[PDB]
Amino acid sequence: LVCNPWFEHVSMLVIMLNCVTLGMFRPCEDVECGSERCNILEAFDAFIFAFFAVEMVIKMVALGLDTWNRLDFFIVVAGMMEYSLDGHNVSLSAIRTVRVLRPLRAINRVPSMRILVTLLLDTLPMLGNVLLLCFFVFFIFGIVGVQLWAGLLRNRCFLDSAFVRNNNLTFLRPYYQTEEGEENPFICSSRRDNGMQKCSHIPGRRINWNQYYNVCRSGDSNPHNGAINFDNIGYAWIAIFQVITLEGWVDIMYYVMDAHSFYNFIYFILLIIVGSFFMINLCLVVIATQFSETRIVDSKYFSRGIMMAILVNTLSMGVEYHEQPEELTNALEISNIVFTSMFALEMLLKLLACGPLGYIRNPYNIFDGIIVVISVWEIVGQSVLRTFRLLRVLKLVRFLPALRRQLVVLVKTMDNVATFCTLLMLFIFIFSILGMHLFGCKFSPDRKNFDSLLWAIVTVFQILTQEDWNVVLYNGMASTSSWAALYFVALMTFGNYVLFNLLVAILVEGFQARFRVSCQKVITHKMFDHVVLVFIFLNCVTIALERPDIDPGSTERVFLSVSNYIFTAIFVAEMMVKVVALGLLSGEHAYLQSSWNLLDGLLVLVSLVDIVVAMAGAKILGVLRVLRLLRTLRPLRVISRAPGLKLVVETLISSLRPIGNIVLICCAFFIIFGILGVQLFKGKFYYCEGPDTRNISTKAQCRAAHYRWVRRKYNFDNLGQALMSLFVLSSKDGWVNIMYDGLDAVGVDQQPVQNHNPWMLLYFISFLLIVSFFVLNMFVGVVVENFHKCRQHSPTRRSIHSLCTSHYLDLFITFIICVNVITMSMEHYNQPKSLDEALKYCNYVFTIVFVFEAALKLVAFGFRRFFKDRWNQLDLAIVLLSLMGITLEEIEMSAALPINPTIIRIMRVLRIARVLKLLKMATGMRALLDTVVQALPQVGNLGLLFMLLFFIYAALGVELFGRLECSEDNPCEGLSRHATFSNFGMAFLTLFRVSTGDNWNGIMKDTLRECSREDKHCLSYLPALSPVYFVTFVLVAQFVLVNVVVAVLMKHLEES
Ligand SMILES: CCCCCCCCCCCCCCC(=O)OC[C@H](COP(=O)(O)OCCN)OC(=O)CCCCCCCCCCCCCC
Ligand SMILES: CC(C)CCC[C@@H](C)[C@H]1CC[C@H]2[C@@H]3CC=C4C[C@@H](OC(=O)CCC(=O)O)CC[C@]4(C)[C@H]3CC[C@]12C
Ligand SMILES: CC(C)CCC[C@@H](C)[C@H]1CC[C@H]2[C@@H]3CC=C4C[C@@H](OC(=O)CCC(=O)O)CC[C@]4(C)[C@H]3CC[C@]12C
Ligand SMILES: CC(C)CCC[C@@H](C)[C@H]1CC[C@H]2[C@@H]3CC=C4C[C@@H](OC(=O)CCC(=O)O)CC[C@]4(C)[C@H]3CC[C@]12C
Ligand SMILES: CC(C)CCC[C@@H](C)[C@H]1CC[C@H]2[C@@H]3CC=C4C[C@@H](OC(=O)CCC(=O)O)CC[C@]4(C)[C@H]3CC[C@]12C
Ligand SMILES: CC(C)(C)CCN1C[C@@H]2[C@@H](CNC(=O)c3cc(Cl)cc(Cl)c3)[C@@H]2C1
Ligand SMILES: [Ca+2]
Q: Which residues lie on this side of the membrane: Cytoplasmic?
């Protein structure tokens, strides 16, 4: 019965049968239970439970009163409750949600999965240290957010009560709301606040009603159906969690900037650094570390000739595009006829030399033969075979040894990843059926729904990639309850920060297992570089003061104009002195013998050319614009002058060499899928834009209805457009929308129809899964190479003294502060007056208790000894700080009111420093932070290279996108009042949003849209430069951040 191993196979068969019965559940067609199919399915489910209820009985009898066995017991008893409770209508359906755990029983039946899970469960205990750091971040930023922005997002511009009452009119809405309704609220700034958005910024009517919305008072709803707000600690953690995932975090920032103050970007910048970067990547560091701790044909010319035949054919395939000329189409087919014939000619020649048996011996020769038959078949059969022509690129593997070796390594990586992938599908399946139970037909239908298994799996996969996952969150919270946020928190936490970091650990472990004399002296002077470095910094200020809105006749323009001439002269003289002392190129140690010296030479050369053009009252405007773009690279001269920056830059370039082959393979995949996408989707990404298009079906009807026929910004018209779309897909920002266009594509001059071709999910999901694999091997390649480099390199006083030295006092304080932590979270918006008194009295008790601790500490150790410890200094600071805050509060109560409420608010917010005491107790957490401290010297320079990259692109963006405008005639999708390149200050802030990858694709869309005909000073070739600006910034910015993750990872390993 149980001894026979085939019994487990019988059990496994039933488990899979129980996975299918769960997958055929229809959310809102089975609840009625009135259909015949449901009736048989329920009987099927009952039969399955009988087996497992029986099987548990035999196992208990044979073995009597294994963690997995406990889980099996829990499923049976929970299911029995549901089955036995039948007949009671009180939350019967709600009890039916427990069956989603049944697929977990498959973990124990598969030995490979069980071992992997057991290893995973053994690493969780070491993640508590990271979990504590999460509590500090969420708790600290959860109160500061609540104390500041409690109830401010309810603000709306209301009509005056006297105005409406006296005039006896009520046709108007009570408060201003755009025609979109509550979906785009207009949050004003109260009179006592200094928010950016005021009730006087209301656009006029388009006699004027909008001018009478001039009262900003609290409304009755927060943004997103009440989902986003800081009214209490519960709602503040939902906002903070969304910021940590970097999805829609700018939207939350703009809400509080519009309501409280523009200087709230400091709060979010620290959160994105402390929590979103370090805290979330320390999870990867800890997991990865812990896992590791547990005759003519053979001629070279003939081979080269065949190589170029394949390569040229591949290039010819990617020259197609929309509205292709007829002659070009004919030429391509003729080219295909020639190339396939040439391959056929090689097919015959090799067969004769080696014979039919000899040819089959070579494995690659087999693949070549399979290609010739289809190529000839296509001609003889004269369109599905056309898409198969892309397999010809695989022939190049024969002649590329570096890539052939690399592909073997990647292919071998699938053996280790196979077990993890099976565990991931189970994780996605369980959460997919759970979502249908909770959000079944509740999203009244949105594309991101749980109405069926197919679209429940796609929505769960989409959430894991963190793309519009907050849009689904708001639907879930509004539809069922605000506590539905736990579904997304658990899905995103167990999935991204636990399971994905386990995949990284698997891969990392697998791979791991007379005048000239004067000049010669001056440049060699110790302070020469420092003197020059001062001038470079002053030249950076001049670059950062440039902006479009400078009046040419103002004194600022002439000041900037003159400063350029001086700096050009200064850097020419510095170059001139150096060349004299070293010689241009003739000498062995000549000036241009080093790349860094050469880099300067180009910069000085361009400056001189700029002067000449400026000297020339001629048609040289186009040239002037280009020189202005190259003049933003001047800050690059800082690297050579700073020894620390020079070393880190040289290290980043070296790190690229080990992963050079992966990048080449990744670049080849982009082209293969880019050409594939063009064939499928070229000419099908057009749509009719109008208020009502339910009757439009073709282009002609769109024109007849007097609407506009417009093309998507990201399309597959040609290989140029396809590569830009694939990069946006790979970046996982805006990748869902591009997928929707592919699904809805119908044909040329045809209106897209929703979910027209669901089979296109394979094209988009496959690209994301494969690319994410390549990008993961790049991270592992850098980690492995770095590790290789590291390896090769009085009686009344005595009683008090006993108490203070004893651990009892420390544990007593830790309890008091814990209570204060709970008390500090009791506050909320519009709390009852009784609570204010109760919380105030609690403050009195804590203040005196802390005061007694200081008094006892002083006597036990003494004034000089007590001040020695840093912890005691921290305690003194807060107690002094706490007394000051309470004193001001009492004066505020008193009749005298000279204290500005701003001071009282700041003191209340700064009272949270009491939590820092627990930092002393958490010995484990402090050690984890100490790992980051030891990595600061390596991480500090990487931060200097991050700010240097920001400066060059921030100044370059202002020159390019400085004058772009947003208006109702030319609406923008990514830019707004908060996101602009108007000045260097705004460009710097916008690039921070882009680096985090939050709606950075919408910003590029704004630069690709054609400028108005009437508008002037529009760059004709801006749409060509925008992809280069955003692609290079994204790749360079992400590489630097990855190397910061590796730097901390190395120190964690070498420390243990
Ligand atoms: C240290 C934390 C780390 C993880 C944080 C991740 C985010 C957690 C979000 C989960 C909490 C969701 C509840 C939020 C909330 O307050 O809303 C619920 C409820 C309003 O919703 P109704 O549908 O009942 O509307 C009623 C309308 N009158 O809010 C309340 O009224 C009070 C609920 C309790 C407030 C929160 C106290 C507990 C702290 C959050 C619980 C989550 C813990 C995470 C482990
Ligand atoms: C990248 C390797 C692996 C393959 C080679 C790819 C090329 C064949 C691609 C890259 C850029 C493509 C071009 C990008 C943009 C255009 C403009 C497009 O529209 C026009 O020519 C505009 C006409 C007008 O404005 O009047 C026609 C296709 C064409 C030339 C594309 C033809 C195919 C090109 C040259
Ligand atoms: C180390 C480098 C980056 C130098 C330090 C940076 C500064 C040069 C930046 C930071 C803040 C910037 C300022 C932020 C805000 C403004 C207002 C803004 O004014 C306008 O655009 C016009 C407003 C109006 O006319 O009402 C742009 C210029 C200025 C002074 C910016 C000029 C450049 C500043 C001083
Ligand atoms: C460690 C901490 C997080 C747990 C202990 C703190 C709780 C006792 C606090 C946290 C937030 C408080 C809530 C914040 C806001 C509200 C809403 C308030 O008004 C409403 O119920 C209206 C809600 C609406 O209109 O949406 C009633 C009290 C209540 C539930 C509070 C009750 C007490 C709560 C749950
Ligand atoms: C291989 C992966 C890592 C991507 C690498 C970057 C590409 C996404 C970039 C490199 C060059 C870019 C192209 C450069 C120029 C153009 C022409 C541009 O159209 C015009 O120039 C017409 C308007 C005008 O005349 O200015 C459309 C985008 C496109 C194809 C760009 C699309 C995005 C491309 C392919
Ligand atoms: C660059 C690195 C240092 C390696 C970290 C990058 N990662 C961080 C981030 C997550 C987003 N989520 C997914 O990619 C995803 C997709 C599926 Cl199907 C299942 C699961 Cl569990 C997760 C990525 C990639
Ligand atoms: Ca996004």
A: 110-129, 357-362, 409-419, 585-594, 648-657, 864-870, 928-941
